[PDB]
Each structure stands twice: as structure tokens, then as C-alpha cells.
Amino acid sequence: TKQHAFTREDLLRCSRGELFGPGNAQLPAPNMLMIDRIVHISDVGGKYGKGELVAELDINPDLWFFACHFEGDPVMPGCLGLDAMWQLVGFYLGWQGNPGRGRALGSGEVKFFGQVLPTAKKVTYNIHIKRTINLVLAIADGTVSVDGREIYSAEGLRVGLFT
């Protein structure tokens, strides 16, 4: 609840279990980590007054997923932008000090109506916490934007912690 932004090094520390400590929420390490920094996190405000995350991923043409997805037609997998939103909701639950390992539990409607090309500069994630329930889980809405343009929406993202 004290720290409201996180550098890449903080997120890498998180991925090693060294931010929330052993048995608690971990981000993936590269190459599954789909966030470079958390610009903002809070447990108040946002769309529902239950908190907000703003996070960023820098794009360059050499990110691994461009070469294989697809050959001659590079586009950041939609599933990985979706996963960034699950990664962030899991981070939020750990950041609130809850114990346990994070799992995505699913979502309501997901829409992909644009793409991240290797010519893009920056992807921004906006997460609005809707509800937490203490079987500890969070429900959230999320958007993915590239260089100012909204391209994905997700309603009812669900993440749980397992102890």
C-alpha cells in the first residue's frame, strides 16, 4: 500500500519471489513477463473506487514473439496482452498483502479490435478493480492501448490466490 509505482527491476525481483516473498504472488519471468513498469497502482479510485493499475510494455522490433507470430506477419499475440491484464490483477492481490500463489480464473467478454505491430513504441494497460472476495480473488475490467489507441477490452477478469 506504500509503493505506487514499480521499475522493471522491481518486477524482475517480483518474478523471483523476492517482492512479496516465498509462496506469495509472482509475476512471470521473461519471456512470459508482459509488463516493463507499473506507472500507477492504488486500492482507491478507478472506475469503481476499488483501485486502479496503469502499466506499460515498451515495443521494439526484436521482441521474441514478433519472429514466430507470425512469420512474415509479425503481431504481438492478443493472448499475451490479455495475460498482462491477469499478471497485473495477480500483482494487485499480492500488493494488498494477501498470501498465496496467483492463477488466472478466466474472464467475461474479451475483444481484440486492433494490433501491436513491431513499429509501435508503447503498450499501456489500464486495470479497474471491480471487487475482491475473502478463497481470495479479484474481479477487474481492463483495456490495452498502443501509442494512445485502445485496441483490446476485457470485462470480468478473475484472478485467485491459492494457499
Next chain:
Amino acid sequence: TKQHAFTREDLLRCSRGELFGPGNAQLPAPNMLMIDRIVHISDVGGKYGKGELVAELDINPDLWFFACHFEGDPVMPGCLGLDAMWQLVGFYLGWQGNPGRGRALGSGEVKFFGQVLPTAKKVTYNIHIKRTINLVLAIADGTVSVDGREIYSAEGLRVGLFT
């Protein structure tokens, strides 16, 4: 419509653009390809009489995503099992002979209620085509199973081809 099963080599050929030809549907190449084989594909039968895919991914402890997701807590990313279902619906649209590049457009409800651990042997995907629309797109329901046990469901998977 003639070939009803596909080996890993066929899928790798598909990823290089060499199965449906240039500008048509491509699977991802490794390490984004989340299918080893298509056991069955048809444009008739399934839950809605509009066709079915059955596909498999062999699991071993050395698959790349176990090491980074998460460190000390290996589990196949749910987002990649979801992506296998988008990959298969895209394959179906190309297999029917439609032109254009594949994009996931989203889904209705996704649920993850189990996990793929590095001790699992085989993941099976079952896709039921619900509807196609000719702006060419397919709508489908999907399940992910590990060693006989259903663990994920997705309703209203959507994939489109872009010409």
C-alpha cells in the same frame, strides 16, 4: 476438406505459410505454436453440426514456459491454452479454403478451473464450430483437457481473416 489429421511437420509447414500459401492463415512457429498435432478436423458434426477440431500438445518438464511461469511454481500459462483454441479456429478457416491472415477477435466467457503441471503427459483441445459468417469469421466453443480431465472452457471464441 480432404485431409482430416495433421502431423507436427504439417503444422510447422503451416507456420511457414507453405500449407495454405502466402497471405492465408498461418499458425505461429515455436515458441508460440501451442499444438503438436490435429488428431481430427471436419466441417460437419461436432456439438452444432458445423464441424469439430481435436488437437494435442505433448507435455514434458523442459517446455520453455515452465521455467519462467512461475519460477519455483511451474504451470502452463492459461493464456497459451486459450491461444491454442484461437490458433485452431484460425486453422479451420484456412482449411475451408478462405483467403486472408488470421486474427483472434476475442471470446465470451473463459474459465480456468485446473492446471497443466510439468508432470502432465498430454493436453487435448476440443473445438466446436458454432457459426461462420462471409468479413470472414468463425465463432466456436472450446475445452482444454489434461490427461482426461477438463480444466478450461471458452464460449464464443472469435477469429477473423483479413484480406
